[PDB]
């Protein structure tokens, strides 16, 4: 009836904690998940590194991102790595996550703040020149503003992370979409969203 099997769990990917539990300390942008996290301190710290050892994927491939843009990408990582409220969207590839609905604000602000930064492809899931150990832009792929390769917020949310996320038309506090970041003061707005979807009442 309610999908409690699917609540308060962590996906089986190589970095993730097997089970969620509180942490004394998490680095910067992953602080909102202190209460109950699927990331260790080390994971949280690693999320903020240039060419994070978590993925060996370079964001600076078209040069260094504006800090505001970088912040969004890091938060995405914090969320992916730390959230105990993704059960309903977990699927096998040894697991991943598919079409987690990010609230419209999250995708819009992310898009907004990355407009000035630069990239070379619109589908980051593959098709990279991988020769150095880390991805670089393939021959003939021009570095241009994000708004060129990601004309909409939806493009950005969905294609950078290989359909791990879906751009929901629902707005924050609807009860029907998740925030990739939230102020620790405010309490976690995604717990109830997870519950709802776990239930037989929503798919």
């Amino acid at each position: 009836p309610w999908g409690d099997e699917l609540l308060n769990i962590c996906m089986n990917a190589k970095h993730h904690k097997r089970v969620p539990s509180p942490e004394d300390k998490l680095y910067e942008e992953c602080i909102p998940w202190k209460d109950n996290a699927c990331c260790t301190l080390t994971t949280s710290w690693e999320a903020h590194l240039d060419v994070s050892p978590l993925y060996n994927f370079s964001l600076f491939h078209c040069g260094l991102l504006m800090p505001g843009c970088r912040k969004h990408f890091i938060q995405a990582i914090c969320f992916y790595e730390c959230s105990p409220n993704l059960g309903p969207w977990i699927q096998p590839v040894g697991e991943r996550v598919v079409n987690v609905p990010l609230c419209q604000e999250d995708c819009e602000e992310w898009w907004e703040d990355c407009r000035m930064s630069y990239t070379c492809k619109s589908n980051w899931r593959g098709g990279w020149d991988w020769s150095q150990g880390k991805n670089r832009c393939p021959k003939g792929a021009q570095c241009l503003p994000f708004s060129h390769y990601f004309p909409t917020p939806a493009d950005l949310c969905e294609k950078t992370w290989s359909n791990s996320f879906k751009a929901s038309p629902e707005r924050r506090n609807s009860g029907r979409c998740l925030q990739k970041w939230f102020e620790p003061a405010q309490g976690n707005p995604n717990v109830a969203v997870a519950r709802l979807f776990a239930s037989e009442f929503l798919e």
């Binding site: 710290w45 040069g63 021009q142």
Partner: protein, 232 residues
């Protein structure tokens, strides 16, 4: 295709406007002005001499710009005209770009994120759009342990200062903790003092201490652990 970072300097852009409006009428056929300037603007909007991150610091920008403007004035003061002028100019721009490439490469190897541990915040200028913002240089979670032995009855100095803290932006306060064996802590000082002095030490002052340099951001910029031994 990326700009020659030197246009981020206002004095440079104004010097280029002054060249167009003040110098070209007296030193070049009117027919040639528009093409000349399109040509100049192309030389400046593309910088081929450069792993280039697209950023620069104010010092590096200034050095390049100063050099450039100095040489540019050399040309205008010489009062040179026509072919002579055109060819000297572009030849100059070429050589300037090579010189500036050096300043950049030096900046990347020596001044970009010089911290060897922790997190330094430093202001950079993005060449692609002349936007100037603060970048985080993250090197390591820790800055490592210090093992310290103190003669009994002498003063213990714990130094939390690093080479780069003076340079970093967005720093607040050095907090010092005692770390007890029972998994708890106590804050003992918190201020602009980069050191902690405990005078005339006794055996009870041995053990673990931690320093945290605070940041305007949500996490600390430097963490150093001291392990203190007292010689009885």
């Amino acid at each position: 295709r990326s700009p020659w970072c030197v246009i981020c300097d206002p004095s440079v852009v104004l010097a280029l406007k002054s060249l167009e409006k003040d110098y070209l009428p007296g030193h070049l056929d009117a027919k040639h002005h528009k093409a000349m300037m399109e040509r100049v603007e192309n030389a400046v909007k593309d910088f081929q001499e450069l792993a280039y991150m697209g950023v620069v610091d104010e010092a590096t920008l200034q050095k390049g710009s100063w050099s450039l403007l100095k040489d540019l004035k050399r040309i205008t003061d010489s009062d040179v005209k026509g072919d002579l002028f055109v060819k000297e100019l572009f030849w100059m721009l070429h050589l300037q770009k090579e010189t500036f490439a050096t300043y950049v490469a030096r900046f990347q190897k020596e001044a970009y994120c010089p911290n060897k541990c922790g997190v330094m915040l430093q202001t950079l200028i993005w060449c692609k759009n002349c936007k100037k913002e603060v970048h985080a240089c993250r090197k390591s979670y820790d800055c490592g342990e210090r093992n310290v032995e103190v003669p009994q009855m002498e003063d213990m100095i714990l130094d939390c200062e690093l080479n780069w803290h003076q340079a970093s932006e967005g720093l607040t306060d050095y907090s010092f903790y005692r770390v007890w064996g029972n998994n708890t802590e106590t804050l003992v000082s918190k201020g602009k003092e980069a050191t902690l002095t405990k005078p005339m030490v006794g055996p009870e002052d041995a053990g673990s201490y931690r320093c945290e340099l605070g940041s305007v951001n949500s996490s600390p910029a430097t963490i150093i652990n001291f392990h203190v031994t007292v010689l009885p």
